[PDB]
DNA sequence: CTATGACCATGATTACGAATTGC
DNA sequence: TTAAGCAATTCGTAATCATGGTCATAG
């Protein structure tokens, strides 16, 4: 539709290009000046016309040692390895290779590796022609021949082989996102006659370009167009979509500029003749082949930069190109910037023990970028579901029936048409709110990787990336380790607890950034890691070498510095830039939001040493991991030693203070007095003195008091948060216990909660017990709603559930008859109800779907959310103010509510009903026994109470769903599994229908007919 | 039948007749004509020639928990 | 018709394998 | 071709052992 501006006057002999780069790509080439790949760099200018940009001249290499004969410092034996061996039987040897210009060269470098000295040795360079010749180099290299006139004998090992673009990346200096200069006469526009679809299409030498690194006036962003999209197919009845029989009925599709509040570009195409709607564009086909031409040639058009959407990847693309080449159109794949490339459809999987496992699809779009916002949440947060609606709901607060909605009249489409454009304008909002892009190009700036690295890779790229970008600066190559395998070594040390309740003030005082500050303060590296012999036979060990607990030597850094801590150095200013910034906003969800900005930062910090133990991995080095724990358990005791030991009854203070807790970076002392304005000050005085006496950066710091205090176990405590003093009280904080897990019921949750709040806030102990009777009573008595009873759990991969049996793992691959085409996958999270039966053997066989038993009525097993989900929670944190006896009286406040429950032959009932009274079956349909008739008038008084509150319950609900539908003029449809507001709709009509024909039984108040 | 069936689905949808997903099928009838917006008599002509059958008398989304 | 013996099951306790959180 | 690492508390689920209760036989 709308078209972007027109690139009016630029002229290469004067004027220079200045643009920012958003995807790079690799190209296998004809058409050379008179090397093969030639690079691709996508971009915008600082007005919004579209570049590429084509790059020539660069070809990979590696490196490798010159072997101590008389071959490899000899030209003729130089030229010798360029030269083939023209015998016979080395066709495996100079075939797969063959006649490529690897060539020769001679470099002073070093290894990595250890410390050895200050004395570099030849190294040979070999180039390679193509990227896809290095892999065949390396099979015949190494255990290849190498008997070449008796040059290289082998073997030399291979050192840094890395990625092509990373290695284009790491020798000019372009990062992430950034800005690119042409100068003057060195770029010519109209050398490359039109390949691509781009307003300027420059064609410069990769030695012209000059990269502006972001800072300054650099550190700006050009303006992007983002678009996103949503669809619509209409299915049978229980039969899940499929490309093969379900057209594709309306397309809808939003678009804007970046840094404008508002869209510019709303459109929505339809199958059928629909109604006009105000703010957006309506066109209308009588066939689907129109619909997909249309939606190819508006991409084409408005040639946007970025895609988002929600679950984009693995339902909306394929479906179009599998519906496409069903229906014989041949024009739609060619979706990318490239005249003459069409897409294809593409599997991958990704696994760690940080995110678990996750298999998507993908789809080719060259130039363009994909940012599906169901991956960043998946990534990014840990949640209890995942649905569209229930995120919207933690974040903002909000088949069958459209296959009618579309077989009917046109203002039905313009509903429909309506609804599909509000969903495909939630996730722009979302990427907008949540500070995505923002911080997407802030991390691609300060690691150095692509901006499509940081959907697909986890973070071992980014410490290799900057690890080579530190090591171009001192002339160091960089060694390849592999090993399989290791063992593992001693973690954190934990203070063994003194368990209970405490009512004097505890604080608590911690060491901030402890890893990357003893990885810094002690000059630890690789390339520092002194070997157990090469100390000896020199004995200078004083301030020139140091030793570990574990028992390595460290060189001192009158020596060296190592490459370690300067990356760490630099991740932590970015660190702490982000918290000078979050220190001074005022809106709750912002500063969550840069909170989770300097999170980030963070997780990049500690993941930068736990490169180091991974003995799966690239180069493990697990002598540095080893130190790195000794220092920590050695410094924690040395606190605890300290802060117990000084403040003491006969160094003048008040009392000797005891440390109750601590757990690796934290210490919990318990210093005697019960103002919280002296225990903030002595705390204050503790960290700061015992800080001093340490290296620097290694710093103490108060951080809080709690006051009253509960420890249960090892990692499970709970208190309330003093920041101040006149900021009297924050919140609570709930370490570890059964209400921040997602393992169980809300009912549990809400009700430790609940517990906590009266037990810590009003300290009343009464209310508590109340409280957790009458949640016990009306659990019995079956007036809990079934959004509390829901259990989920995540389904991982499949051969460890093969292992043993599971519930969630029963439910799923137990198919519905309605729909074996929509199940859980690997990955997403399963939800289940525990219904009543009789095989007490096993609960995974009594668990049922949600809405199967909402549609199809079965009964829940009340005990078993009695004794197995609620009881034991609640022994854990009831028992420590009191006795035994607190066991006996919440068994004993069972015990007085557990004696009130309510629950082929069994259709054959009816046709009388019981005394309202007495519970006397009896002849008749009166509601009064004959004991029992004198007291009736207060037995009618009763009940009609309970009628006016359904009654008011009833109306209450009903108009919910009419303002959060926003209509009152039509009817409702939403069964949103998410919402509260359905289930408990339906329950109360029912509620109504027995309580008014109870009230039946008594005769009518009068007459009707008069 | 099954033209039948789809004039009873086009005149559960037309909205000038009313906003009816919770009664009957002959009582909107009814309703329209006591008002008199428009009701045609085809809509009528086939609720008299059956019996009570779930799938005449009936309103499209009877099932369905809403 | 009772008493004794055998079988059978049922319930409880202990030990192992698995989602999430602490580092 | 790509993956951040390990220590666990903790509770659930399954299996094994013990204990009694009921039924059938024999005197
Ligand atoms: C959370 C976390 C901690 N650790 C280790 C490194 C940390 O130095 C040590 C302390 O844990 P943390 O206190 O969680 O982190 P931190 O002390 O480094 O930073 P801050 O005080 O500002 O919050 O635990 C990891 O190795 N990986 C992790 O994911
Ligand atoms: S049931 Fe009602 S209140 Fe609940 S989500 Fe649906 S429309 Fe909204
Ligand atoms: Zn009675």
Same mark, same amino acid.
């Given at each position: 539709?709308?078209?972007?501006?027109?690139?009016?006057?630029?002229?290469?002999?004067?004027?220079?290009?200045?643009?920012?780069?958003?995807?790079?790509?690799?190209?296998?080439?004809?058409?050379?000046?008179?090397?093969?790949?030639?690079?691709?760099?996508?971009?915008?200018?600082?007005?919004?016309?579209?570049?590429?940009?084509?790059?020539?001249?660069?070809?990979?290499?590696?490196?490798?040692?010159?072997?101590?004969?008389?071959?490899?410092?000899?030209?003729?034996?130089?030229?010798?390895?360029?030269?083939?061996?023209?015998?016979?039987?080395?066709?495996?040897?100079?075939?797969?290779?063959?006649?490529?210009?690897?060539?020769?060269?001679?470099?002073?470098?070093?290894?990595?590796?250890?410390?050895?000295?200050?004395?570099?040795?030849?190294?040979?360079?070999?180039?390679?022609?193509?990227?896809?010749?290095?892999?065949?180099?390396?099979?015949?290299?190494?255990?290849?021949?190498?008997?070449?006139?008796?040059?290289?004998?082998?073997?030399?090992?291979?050192?840094?082989?890395?990625?092509?673009?990373?290695?284009?990346?790491?020798?000019?200096?372009?990062?992430?996102?950034?800005?690119?200069?042409?100068?003057?006469?060195?770029?010519?526009?109209?050398?490359?006659?039109?390949?691509?679809?781009?307003?300027?299409?420059?064609?410069?030498?990769?030695?012209?370009?000059?990269?502006?690194?972001?800072?300054?006036?650099?550190?700006?962003?050009?303006?992007?167009?983002?678009?996103?999209?949503?669809?619509?197919?209409?299915?049978?009845?229980?039969?899940?979509?499929?490309?093969?029989?379900?057209?594709?009925?309306?397309?809808?599709?939003?678009?804007?500029?970046?840094?404008?509040?508002?869209?510019?570009?709303?459109?929505?195409?339809?199958?059928?003749?629909?109604?006009?709607?105000?703010?957006?564009?309506?066109?209308?086909?009588?066939?689907?082949?129109?619909?997909?031409?249309?939606?190819?040639?508006?991409?084409?058009?408005?040639?946007?930069?970025?895609?988002?959407?929600?679950?984009?990847?693995?339902?909306?693309?394929?479906?179009?190109?599998?519906?496409?080449?069903?229906?014989?159109?041949?024009?739609?794949?060619?979706?990318?910037?490239?005249?003459?490339?069409?897409?294809?459809?593409?599997?991958?999987?990704?696994?760690?023990?940080?995110?678990?496992?996750?298999?998507?699809?993908?789809?080719?779009?060259?130039?363009?970028?994909?940012?599906?916002?169901?991956?960043?949440?998946?990534?990014?947060?840990?949640?209890?579901?995942?649905?569209?609606?229930?995120?919207?709901?933690?974040?903002?607060?909000?088949?069958?029936?459209?296959?009618?909605?579309?077989?009917?009249?046109?203002?039905?489409?313009?509903?429909?048409?309506?609804?599909?454009?509000?969903?495909?304008?939630?996730?722009?909002?979302?990427?907008?709110?949540?500070?995505?892009?923002?911080?997407?190009?802030?991390?691609?700036?300060?690691?150095?990787?692509?901006?499509?690295?940081?959907?697909?890779?986890?973070?071992?790229?980014?410490?290799?990336?900057?690890?080579?970008?530190?090591?171009?600066?001192?002339?160091?190559?960089?060694?390849?380790?592999?090993?399989?395998?290791?063992?593992?070594?001693?973690?954190?040390?934990?203070?063994?607890?003194?368990?209970?309740?405490?009512?004097?003030?505890?604080?608590?005082?911690?060491?901030?950034?402890?890893?990357?500050?003893?990885?810094?303060?002690?000059?630890?590296?690789?390339?520092?890691?002194?070997?157990?012999?090469?100390?000896?036979?020199?004995?200078?060990?004083?301030?020139?070498?140091?030793?570990?607990?574990?028992?390595?030597?460290?060189?001192?850094?009158?020596?060296?510095?190592?490459?370690?801590?300067?990356?760490?150095?630099?991740?932590?200013?970015?660190?702490?830039?982000?918290?000078?910034?979050?220190?001074?906003?005022?809106?709750?969800?912002?500063?969550?939001?840069?909170?989770?900005?300097?999170?980030?930062?963070?997780?990049?910090?500690?993941?930068?040493?736990?490169?180091?133990?991974?003995?799966?991995?690239?180069?493990?080095?697990?002598?540095?991991?080893?130190?790195?724990?000794?220092?920590?358990?050695?410094?924690?005791?040395?606190?605890?030693?300290?802060?117990?030991?000084?403040?003491?009854?006969?160094?003048?203070?008040?009392?000797?203070?005891?440390?109750?807790?601590?757990?690796?970076?934290?210490?919990?002392?318990?210093?005697?007095?019960?103002?919280?304005?002296?225990?903030?000050?002595?705390?204050?005085?503790?960290?700061?003195?015992?800080?001093?006496?340490?290296?620097?950066?290694?710093?103490?710091?108060?951080?809080?008091?709690?006051?009253?205090?509960?420890?249960?176990?090892?990692?499970?405590?709970?208190?309330?948060?003093?920041?101040?003093?006149?900021?009297?009280?924050?919140?609570?904080?709930?370490?570890?216990?059964?209400?921040?897990?997602?393992?169980?019921?809300?009912?549990?949750?809400?009700?430790?909660?609940?517990?906590?709040?009266?037990?810590?806030?009003?300290?009343?102990?009464?209310?508590?017990?109340?409280?957790?009777?009458?949640?016990?009573?009306?659990?019995?008595?079956?007036?809990?709603?079934?959004?509390?009873?829901?259990?989920?759990?995540?389904?991982?991969?499949?051969?460890?559930?093969?292992?043993?049996?599971?519930?969630?793992?029963?439910?799923?691959?137990?198919?519905?008859?309605?729909?074996?085409?929509?199940?859980?996958?690997?990955?997403?999270?399963?939800?289940?109800?525990?219904?009543?039966?009789?095989?007490?053997?096993?609960?995974?066989?009594?668990?049922?779907?949600?809405?199967?038993?909402?549609?199809?009525?079965?009964?829940?097993?009340?005990?078993?959310?009695?004794?197995?989900?609620?009881?034991?929670?609640?022994?854990?944190?009831?028992?420590?103010?009191?006795?035994?006896?607190?066991?006996?009286?919440?068994?004993?406040?069972?015990?007085?509510?557990?004696?009130?429950?309510?629950?082929?032959?069994?259709?054959?009932?009816?046709?009388?009903?019981?005394?309202?009274?007495?519970?006397?079956?009896?002849?008749?349909?009166?509601?009064?026994?004959?004991?029992?008739?004198?007291?009736?008038?207060?037995?009618?008084?009763?009940?009609?109470?309970?009628?006016?509150?359904?009654?008011?319950?009833?109306?209450?609900?009903?108009?919910?769903?009419?303002?959060?539908?926003?209509?009152?003029?039509?009817?409702?449809?939403?069964?949103?599994?998410?919402?509260?507001?359905?289930?408990?709709?339906?329950?109360?009509?029912?509620?109504?229908?027995?309580?008014?024909?109870?009230?039946?039984?008594?005769?009518?108040?009068?007459?009707?007919?008069? | 039948?099954?033209?039948?069936?789809?004039?009873?689905?086009?005149?559960?949808?037309?909205?000038?007749?009313?906003?009816?997903?919770?009664?009957?099928?002959?009582?909107?009838?009814?309703?329209?004509?006591?008002?008199?917006?428009? &009701?045609? &008599?085809?809509?009528?002509?086939?609720?008299?020639?059956?019996?009570?059958?779930?799938?005449?008398?009936?309103?499209?989304?009877?099932?369905? &928990?809403?």
């Amino acid at each position: 539709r709308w078209l972007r501006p027109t690139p009016p006057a630029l002229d290469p002999q004067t004027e220079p290009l200045i643009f920012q780069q958003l995807e790079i790509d690799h190209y296998v080439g004809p058409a050379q000046p008179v090397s093969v790949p030639v690079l691709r760099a996508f971009g915008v200018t600082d007005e919004g016309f579209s570049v590429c940009c084509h790059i020539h001249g660069f070809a990979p290499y590696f490196y490798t040692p010159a072997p101590p004969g008389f071959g490899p410092e000899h030209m003729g034996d130089l030229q010798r390895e360029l030269n083939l061996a023209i015998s016979r039987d080395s066709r495996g040897g100079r075939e797969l290779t063959g006649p490529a210009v690897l060539a020769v060269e001679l470099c002073s470098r070093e290894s990595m590796f250890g410390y050895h000295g200050h004395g570099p040795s030849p190294f040979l360079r070999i180039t390679v022609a193509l990227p896809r010749l290095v892999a065949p180099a390396r099979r015949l290299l190494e255990q290849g021949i190498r008997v070449a006139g008796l040059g290289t004998p082998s073997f030399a090992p291979y050192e840094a082989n890395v990625d092509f673009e990373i290695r284009f990346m790491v020798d000019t200096d372009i990062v992430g996102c950034n800005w690119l200069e042409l100068p003057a006469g060195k770029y010519a526009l109209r050398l490359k006659e039109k390949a691509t679809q781009c307003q300027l299409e420059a064609d410069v030498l990769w030695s012209d370009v000059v990269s502006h690194p972001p800072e300054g006036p650099w550190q700006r962003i050009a303006p992007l167009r983002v678009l996103s999209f949503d669809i619509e197919c209409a299915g049978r009845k229980g039969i899940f979509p499929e490309p093969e029989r379900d057209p594709v009925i309306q397309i809808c599709s939003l678009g804007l500029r970046w840094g404008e509040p508002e869209p510019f570009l709303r459109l929505a195409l339809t199958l059928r003749p629909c109604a006009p709607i105000l703010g957006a564009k309506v066109q209308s086909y009588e066939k689907e082949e129109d619909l997909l031409q249309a939606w190819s040639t508006f991409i084409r058009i408005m040639d946007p930069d970025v895609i988002t959407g929600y679950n984009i990847q693995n339902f909306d693309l394929p479906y179009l190109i599998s519906r496409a080449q069903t229906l014989k159109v041949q024009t739609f794949p060619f979706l990318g910037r490239v005249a003459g490339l069409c897409s294809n459809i593409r599997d991958s999987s990704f696994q760690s023990k940080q995110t678990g496992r996750r298999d998507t699809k993908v789809v080719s779009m060259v130039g363009r970028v994909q940012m599906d916002m169901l991956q960043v949440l998946l990534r990014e947060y840990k949640l209890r579901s995942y649905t569209l609606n229930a995120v919207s709901f933690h974040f903002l607060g909000e088949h069958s029936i459209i296959t009618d909605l579309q077989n009917g009249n046109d203002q039905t489409r313009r509903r429909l048409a309506v609804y599909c454009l509000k969903d495909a304008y939630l996730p722009l909002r979302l990427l907008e709110r949540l500070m995505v892009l923002v911080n997407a190009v802030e991390m691609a700036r300060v690691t150095g990787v692509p901006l499509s690295y940081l959907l697909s890779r986890g973070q071992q790229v980014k410490v290799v990336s900057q690890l080579l970008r530190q090591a171009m600066h001192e002339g160091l190559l960089m060694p390849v380790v592999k090993s399989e395998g290791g063992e593992d070594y001693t973690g954190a040390t934990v203070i063994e607890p003194l368990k209970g309740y405490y009512d004097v003030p505890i604080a608590t005082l911690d060491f901030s950034s402890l890893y990357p500050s003893i990885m810094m303060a002690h000059n630890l590296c690789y390339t520092t890691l002194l070997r157990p012999g090469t100390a000896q036979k020199l004995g200078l060990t004083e301030d020139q070498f140091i030793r570990t607990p574990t028992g390595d030597e460290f060189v001192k850094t009158s020596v060296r510095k190592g490459l370690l801590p300067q990356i760490l150095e630099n991740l932590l200013s970015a660190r702490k830039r982000a918290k000078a910034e979050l220190a001074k906003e005022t809106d709750p969800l912002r500063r969550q939001v840069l909170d989770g900005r300097q999170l980030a930062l963070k997780v990049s910090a500690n993941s930068v040493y736990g490169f180091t133990g991974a003995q799966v991995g690239k180069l493990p080095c697990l002598e540095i991991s080893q130190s790195v724990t000794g220092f920590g358990r050695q410094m924690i005791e040395k606190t605890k030693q300290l802060v117990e030991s000084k403040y003491t009854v006969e160094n003048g203070y008040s009392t000797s203070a005891k440390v109750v807790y601590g757990d690796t970076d934290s210490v919990m002392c318990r210093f005697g007095v019960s103002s919280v304005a002296e225990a903030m000050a002595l705390g204050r005085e503790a960290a700061d003195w015992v800080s001093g006496h340490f290296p620097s950066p290694i710093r103490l710091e108060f951080e809080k008091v709690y006051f009253p205090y509960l420890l249960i176990s090892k990692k499970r405590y709970a208190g309330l948060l003093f920041s101040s003093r006149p900021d009297a009280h924050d919140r609570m904080d709930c370490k570890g216990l059964e209400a921040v897990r997602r393992d169980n019921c809300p009912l549990v949750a809400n009700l430790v909660t609940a517990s906590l709040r009266r037990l810590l806030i009003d300290r009343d102990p009464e209310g508590a017990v109340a409280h957790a009777q009458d949640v016990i009573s009306d659990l019995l008595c079956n007036r809990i709603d079934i959004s509390q009873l829901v259990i989920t759990k995540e389904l991982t991969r499949a051969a460890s559930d093969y292992a043993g049996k599971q519930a969630h793992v029963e439910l799923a691959e137990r198919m519905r008859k309605r729909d074996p085409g929509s199940a859980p996958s690997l990955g997403d999270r399963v939800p289940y109800v525990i219904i009543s039966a009789a095989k007490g053997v096993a609960a995974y066989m009594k668990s049922e779907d949600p809405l199967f038993v909402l549609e199809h009525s079965l009964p829940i097993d009340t005990q078993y959310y009695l004794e197995q989900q609620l009881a034991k929670p609640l022994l854990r944190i009831f028992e420590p103010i009191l006795g035994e006896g607190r066991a006996e009286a919440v068994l004993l406040r069972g015990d007085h509510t557990r004696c009130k429950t309510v629950l082929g032959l069994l259709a054959f009932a009816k046709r009388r009903n019981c005394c309202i009274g007495c519970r006397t079956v009896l002849s008749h349909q009166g509601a009064v026994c004959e004991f029992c008739q004198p007291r009736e008038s207060e037995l009618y008084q009763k009940e009609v109470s309970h009628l006016n509150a359904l009654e008011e319950r009833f109306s209450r609900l009903w108009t919910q769903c009419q303002r959060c539908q926003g209509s009152l003029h039509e009817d409702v449809i939403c069964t949103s599994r998410d919402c509260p507001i359905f289930y408990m709709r339906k329950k109360v009509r029912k509620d109504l229908e027995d309580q008014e024909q109870l009230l039946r039984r008594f005769g009518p108040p009068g007459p009707e007919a008069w | 039948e099954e033209a039948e069936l789809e004039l009873l689905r086009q005149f559960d949808l037309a909205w000038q007749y009313g906003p009816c997903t919770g009664i009957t099928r002959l009582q909107r009838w009814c309703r329209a004509k006591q008002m008199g917006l428009e &009701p045609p &008599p085809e809509v009528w002509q086939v609720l008299k020639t059956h019996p009570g059958d779930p799938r005449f008398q009936c309103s499209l989304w009877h099932l369905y &928990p809403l």
